[PDB]
Amino acid sequence: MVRCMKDDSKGKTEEELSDLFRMFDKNADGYIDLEELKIMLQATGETITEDDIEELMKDGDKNNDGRIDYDEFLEFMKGVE
Ligand SMILES: [Mg+2]
Ligand SMILES: [Mg+2]
Numbered sequence: 001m002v003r004c005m006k007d008d009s010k011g012k013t014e015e016e017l018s019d020l021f022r023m024f025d026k027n028a029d030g031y032i033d034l035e036e037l038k039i040m041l042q043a044t045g046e047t048i049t050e051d052d053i054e055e056l057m058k059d060g061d062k063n064n065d066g067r068i069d070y071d072e073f074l075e076f077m078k079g080v081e
Contacts, residue, residue: 017077021070031067 022028026036034057041048041056060068060076068076 014074017074018070020077021073024073031069032073033067037068 024032024037024040026039034054037056038053041053057068059080060073062072062075
């Protein structure tokens, strides 16, 4: 009423990255494959090789399952040095 009201609703948090994760997906399945991630790359203004595209998979696939999920991907955009 005066100070305590509703729950803490900060500005842009991690969840905000959810909007960026979907962008990487084309079929909206929650997981990105080598074929999907390739589309987002080709669409770019530059030219990317197959090797570069694969480098992204291994760089975001910690479980080595074959696809990247919002969980493991979240860390991807949380520093890539
Ligand atoms: Mg996909
Ligand atoms: Mg994975």
